[PDB]
């Protein structure tokens, strides 16, 4: 292949290429009219055809980053321009992309959306690709190409009914956040840490497959994601399409779960394999200890390849423990490597290695007992009240943080409780990991935008594996000077009784926060006393004949009394 464009145009096909090219342009030039991107893509497409016709024809030879880089530089940047002088021969384009600056899409009315989708369809779907990508610049291209199929699907069936369009948006926000964490994680920690992550992931999903079949996959999976983060982005679709292709053909040596997935069309099959259920873990496995802890050959075995040995130890743990989080497994592997290094240059190394599971135990039980305490508490209190018990926890821990932010975390976190304590004990830690990683991802991106505590920052850029623990490590802040009393923020009105449940809660939580900030001393029993007295205050005044006089009057009686319980 001399002509890359034509190597891609041939493999991907025209529809995929155009979408992929549009995504790349959209991801780079975010604030930039749809009609621009459309124009550029049409100029590339037409040029790709002339390279399918003739590899010999000029500039077919030039690299895509040049070719695409060339067209971005076509098109004045008053609205990042300096990279454009020359297509970089990108690292300027990336890190020059904000994760956070465009009006939130406001949906056109459903009859109008339906008319247009019927009237053009091709433009309407293209605009989707266009809008999500500018808003979300680290989304995997292959999944996107599919979300759009799941758009075109909704409209064709719906046009009663599009709550489903709202769900698609919620999934996109997630499959966005995760790709950015993955890309960042590879860039900060290297390709090694990612390869390890992937091992853990796939050996849980496929405990039957051989360590050589996993390893092969991890190399291909790491290639794809290394490209999609580099952003050339046609290769990934090409190379991911070759993974699915491969896995489909080798189901029998991988998973008994892939049958239903590997019948589905090219775009859908790839999504299904990644969501596919873990296989039944095999029978007649020896104990983990016998190769890794019991053997008197560890050091020699570790020495011949350090990396394969570690990779095997991780694969074995993972097949054994689907329940364990991918991050816990990685921490355990790190501990093993650390042990082997101190132990191997030692007299009696086997005696030093032998007591190594004594170290894994604390790491396994930290998250498990953590999950339990919080699932118990969720199960007695329920979503809202649990949210409230979290608002007190975390504002006691980091009071310096801004209230609207506190009330956004704690509500999301309590929503995690209701999405993971639903599941049987088995699946909690994987599910928790999944949801928490987005929330610590967005939280730490914001703290750098507007930093307020040093301790949070340390947790926000220690090892990825360290951070959920580091935040769990955070204790109650005992230097915090109580914020000043302020009457308007502890004053309520008639409106709260009319407002919707959603609105109401946030209002009542926002108060809770500000209460803790003003009285961070008070014990949870004192603070149960107040939220009880508040509950009573709200329901009384909601039944009262003159709401407002009741709110006004009882408000002063309440506050008078509650400050009287400072002491």
């Amino acid at each position, epitope marked *: 292949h001399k002509s890359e464009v034509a190597h891609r145009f041939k493999d991907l096909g025209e529809e995929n290429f155009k979408a992929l090219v549009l995504i790349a342009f959209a991801q780079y030039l975010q604030q930039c009219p749809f009609e621009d991107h459309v124009k550029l893509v049409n100029e590339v497409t037409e040029f790709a055809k002339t390279c399918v016709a003739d590899e010999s024809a000029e500039n077919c030879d030039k690299s895509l980053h040049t070719l695409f880089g060339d067209k971005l530089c076509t098109v004045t940047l008053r609205e990042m321009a300096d990279c454009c002088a020359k297509q970089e021969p990108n690292e300027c384009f990336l890190q020059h992309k904000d994760d956070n600056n465009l009006p939130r899409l406001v949906r056109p009315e459903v009859d109008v959306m339906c008319t247009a989708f019927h009237d053009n369809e091709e433009t309407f779907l293209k605009k989707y690709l266009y809008e999500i990508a500018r808003r979300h610049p680290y989304f995997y291209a292959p999944e996107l190409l599919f979300f759009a199929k799941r758009y075109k699907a909704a409209f064709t069936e719906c046009c009663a009914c599009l709550p489903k369009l709202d769900e698609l948006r919620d999934e996109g926000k997630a499959s966005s956040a995760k790709q950015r964490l993955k890309c960042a994680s590879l860039q900060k920690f290297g390709e090694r840490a990612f390869k390890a992550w992937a091992v853990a992931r796939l050996s849980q999903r496929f405990p*039957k*497959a*051989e*360590f*050589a079949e996993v*390893s*092969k996959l991890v190399t291909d999976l790491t290639k794809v994601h290394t490209e999609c983060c580099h952003g050339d982005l046609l290769e990934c679709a090409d190379d991911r399409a070759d993974l699915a292709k491969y896995i489909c053909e080798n189901q029998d*040596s991988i998973s008994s779960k892939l049958k239903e997935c590997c019948e589905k069309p090219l775009l859908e099959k790839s999504h299904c394999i990644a969501e596919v259920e873990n296989d039944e873990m*095999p*029978a*007649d*496995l*020896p*104990s983990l200890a*016998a*190769d*890794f802890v*019991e*053997s008197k*050959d*560890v050091c020699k*075995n570790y020495a*011949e390849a350090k990396d*394969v040995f570690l990779g*095997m130890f991780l694969y074995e743990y993972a097949r054994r423990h689907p329940d364990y989080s991918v991050v816990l497994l990685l921490r355990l592997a790190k501990t093993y490597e650390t042990t082997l290094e101190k132990c191997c240059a030692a007299a009696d190394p086997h005696e030093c290695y032998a007591k190594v599971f004594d170290e894994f135990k604390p790491l396994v039980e930290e998250p498990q007992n953590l999950i339990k305490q919080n699932c118990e508490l969720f199960e007695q209190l329920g979503e809202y009240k649990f949210q409230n018990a979290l608002l007190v926890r975390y504002t006691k821990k980091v009071p310096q943080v801004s209230t609207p932010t506190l009330v956004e975390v704690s509500r999301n976190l309590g929503k995690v409780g209701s999405k993971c304590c639903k599941h049987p004990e088995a699946k909690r830690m994987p599910c928790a990991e999944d949801y928490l990683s987005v929330v610590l991802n967005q939280l730490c991106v914001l703290h750098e935008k507007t930093p307020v505590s040093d301790r949070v920052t340390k947790c926000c850029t220690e090892s990825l594996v360290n951070r959920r623990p580091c935040f769990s490590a955070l204790e109650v802040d005992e230097t915090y000077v109580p914020k000043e009393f302020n009457a308007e923020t502890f004053t309520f009105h008639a409106d709260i009784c009319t407002l919707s449940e959603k609105e109401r809660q946030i209002k009542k939580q926002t108060a809770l926060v500000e209460l803790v900030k003003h009285k961070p001393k008070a014990t949870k029993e004192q603070l149960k006393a107040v939220m009880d007295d508040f509950a009573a205050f709200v329901e009384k005044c909601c039944k009262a004949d003159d709401k407002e006089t009741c709110f006004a009057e009882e408000g002063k009686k309440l506050v008078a009394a509650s400050q009287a319980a400072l002491g």
Partner: nanobody
Amino acid sequence: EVQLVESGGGLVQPGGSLRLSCTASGYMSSTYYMAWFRQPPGKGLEGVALISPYGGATNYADSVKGRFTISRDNAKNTLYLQMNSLKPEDTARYYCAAGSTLTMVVANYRYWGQGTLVTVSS
């Protein structure tokens, strides 16, 4: 491809010894759970001995416990089977297998050898 190759097999006096070797070729050849299976004349395959990737775990059929040992070099890429106190019973084609588990099931091994023959009689 992941090739297996066997050798060491022949004729041997009852009471004597033989050491089979299987050399392994292909990616990640060292990693796999590996097994010896024998096929006595006019019968099916049956597991003689099994060995984990680093030789820290070994199963044996009862037929041969106390007489046979199973070992792997790994660097060499060669799997062994040290046969002692041979009995005419043990006269079977011997076969090498590679898989993902320490199980004694023919179906659960992906890769097989061509098989070396062992005869035991005076």
